[PDB]
Every structure is written in C-alpha cells, then in structure tokens.
Design a binder for this molecule. Structure first.
Ligand SMILES: Nc1nc2c(ncn2[C@@H]2O[C@H](COP(=O)(O)OP(=O)(O)NP(=O)(O)O)[C@@H](O)[C@H]2O)c(=O)[nH]1
Ligand SMILES: [N+]
Ligand SMILES: [N+]
Ligand SMILES: [N+]
Ligand SMILES: [N+]
Ligand SMILES: [N+]
Length: 303
C-alpha cells in the first residue's frame, strides 16, 4: 500500500520509519541504542525537544514491558510518532461562507504563491468560485505574476499600485468577493523577514481590518512552510503563530528531501492542524494531509 506516498517520501524513509529497521537489527535495548536512535531522529530534523520526548517515552515503554531486542522498539516508535501526526490531522473545510477567507502567511520562497494557485484550482474543481487578493503589495513582480496567473486561469485578482496598504487591498478584496458571490477568497501577504516585527504588525492590521466586514474573517490563517528548509520551517511557524495565531499549516516540498521528519517537529511543537502536504508539481500533488497514510508510508517496508 501507499506506493505513491512511499515514493514521495523515499529520501525521508532513509532515516525514519523503515529507516529504523537497519538501526535496530540484532541489537539490544541499552543506553547505547537510545543514543544512536536519538542521533538519527535529530539528523532527520525531528527536533531536539520532540526527539527528547520520543526517547523519554520509548525508554519508559520499553522498560515497562521489559523489551529485550531493539527490533521491538519499531512498533512503539510507530505508535509514538503516529500519535504526534494524528493530533494534527484535521482537513480544511471551506464550505458555507460568503466568502470563506483564507489568509496565507509565511516567508517568501517556501511555496506560498504556488500553494495559492493549487488551492484555487482545487476549489474550482469542487464547484466553488475563487478570488485572490494580491496583498504582497511592495513586490511588484510578485503582484504582476499573481495577476498574470489569474488572467491565465480566469480567476479574479484584486490588486493595487505598488506600495499600497496591504490591509486596504485585502479589505477591498473581501468587499469585491461579497459583491460577486465568491465562495473562497485567498489572500496573499508579504513574506520579508528583514525587520520581522514590522511584518507581524502588518499581518495583525490586516486581521483587524477584516473584522469590519466579517467578524468571522479570516476563517483560516494558513502558514506555508518548506520541508526542505529543515528547522527553519519550525522557527518560521513559531514566529507567525505567536504573532497572529495560525489555524492551519501547509508543508511543501516533501518529495525528494531527506528532511521530511521536520513534520513531526511542526506537529508536536504547535499542535496546529496540518491541512495539506506538497509532494510534487501537479495541482493534485498538493494533498490533504492524512496522518495514517503518512505513518504507514513512512514505516512500511513493502511497497
Ligand atoms: N519540489 C516541490 N516544489 C514546490 C512545492 N510547492 C512549491 N514548490 C516550488 O517552490 C518554489 C517557491 O514557490 P513560490 O510559491 O514561488 O514561493 P513564495 O513563498 O511565494 N516566494 P518567491 O516568489 O520568492 O518564490 C517554486 O518553484 C515552487 O514551484 C512542492 O510541493 N514540491
Ligand atoms: N526543539
Ligand atoms: N470544503
Ligand atoms: N516607496
Ligand atoms: N486597525
Ligand atoms: N525520488
């Protein structure tokens, strides 16, 4: 089973899941084993704190059951790491709002704009009308690229002149979405980390201004982070979550990176639903995150 996701996770499986099998083969459970496993979890970008929790719980579980052979730790690890991901398995539901507003936050270069387009096309295939807001207002090339994409896909894009107030652009986009019976409004935002506190104030202003039109907006504050950036994804998530409060995460570029284990650090550190994982270039390769599929793909040795 899960042959496709196993292929997407091939490089990550070298260290996690089925990658554990060679580590445990023929070994006893002792402090040396747990030191080796800790090292491998850290190399896989699971993170110092999440790795410490896993090791602590495995040690107690192995001792409680008086396990002898390292091979038995495999199933315990599958349970511990599977529970981490199951706690953030909650798909995004965009139904029933006029419009449902998604505020897309994150730094530049991690897949935010790509994810906006994939989400927009997915919602359209579901029968929904979509509109985009070009709220990254000081990056003229990025605004223009979003407008070009919208024109190519017959999806309206609300934009103002270079340097416009992002909260004003997004307010106008909500007004336009309401006026034109739009089902989903996806708002792009700036992603410059230079002087990060200014960006966070910009995002908080966007959120405050939305409430004049709909106290429920934004219905989703979605972070986009890039698994190939390792623990940078975790520090980005902490920055945005402490600043504005996330309600969902998209983790991109899981295909081909050996750093996919960062998903456990993101899940455990914040407890925010992971809505989507990116595993390729097609629209359909932005996949709703399913924790069981993910853990089975990672830990299975068959194909
Ligand atoms: N291999 C892979 N690449 C992805 C995935 N999602 C996004 N990307 C790629 O990552 C790059 C960054 O995409 P983009 O959306 O342009 O990034 P951004 O966060 O808006 N800012 P910038 O314009 O600097 O890129 C693009 O080349 C994109 O095609 C994914 O899921 N897998
Ligand atoms: N950590
Ligand atoms: N939905
Ligand atoms: N300017
Ligand atoms: N405001
Ligand atoms: N691959």
């Amino acid at each position: 089973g899960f042959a496709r996701l196993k292929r997407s996770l091939l490089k990550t499986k070298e260290n996690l899941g089925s990658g554990f099998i060679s580590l445990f083969r023929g070994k006893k459970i002792d402090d040396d084993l747990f030191e080796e496993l800790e090292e491998q979890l850290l190399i896989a970008d699971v993170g110092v704190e999440t790795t410490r929790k896993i090791i602590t719980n495995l040690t107690e579980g192995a001792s409680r059951k008086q396990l002898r052979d390292a091979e038995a730790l495999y199933g315990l690890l599958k349970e511990e790491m599977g529970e981490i991901l199951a706690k953030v398995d909650e798909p995004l539901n965009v139904e029933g709002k006029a419009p449902f507003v998604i505020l897309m936050v994150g730094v530049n270069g991690v897949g935010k704009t790509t994810t906006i387009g994939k989400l927009a096309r997915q919602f359209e295939q579901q029968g929904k009308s979509v509109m985009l807001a070009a709220g990254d207002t000081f990056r003229a090339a990025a605004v223009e690229q979003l407008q070009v994409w919208g024109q190519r896909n017959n999806i309206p894009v609300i934009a103002q002149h270079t340097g416009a107030d992002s909260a004003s652009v997004i307010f106008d986009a909500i007004q336009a979405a309401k006026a034109r019976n739009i089902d989903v409004l996806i708002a792009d935002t700036a992603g410059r980390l230079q002087n990060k506190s200014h960006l966070m104030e910009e995002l908080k202003k966007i959120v405050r201004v939305m409430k004049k039109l709909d106290v429920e907006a934004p219905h989703e504050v979605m972070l986009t982070i890039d698994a190939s950036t390792g623990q940078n994804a975790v520090s980005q998530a902490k920055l945005f979550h402490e600043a504005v409060g996330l309600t969902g995460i998209t983790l991109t570029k899981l295909d081909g990176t050996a750093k996919g284990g960062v998903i456990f650090s993101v899940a455990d550190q914040f407890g925010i639903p992971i809505r989507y994982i990116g595993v390729g270039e097609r629209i359909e390769d932005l996949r709703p995150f399913k924790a069981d599929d993910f853990i089975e793909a990672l830990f299975a040795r068959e194909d």
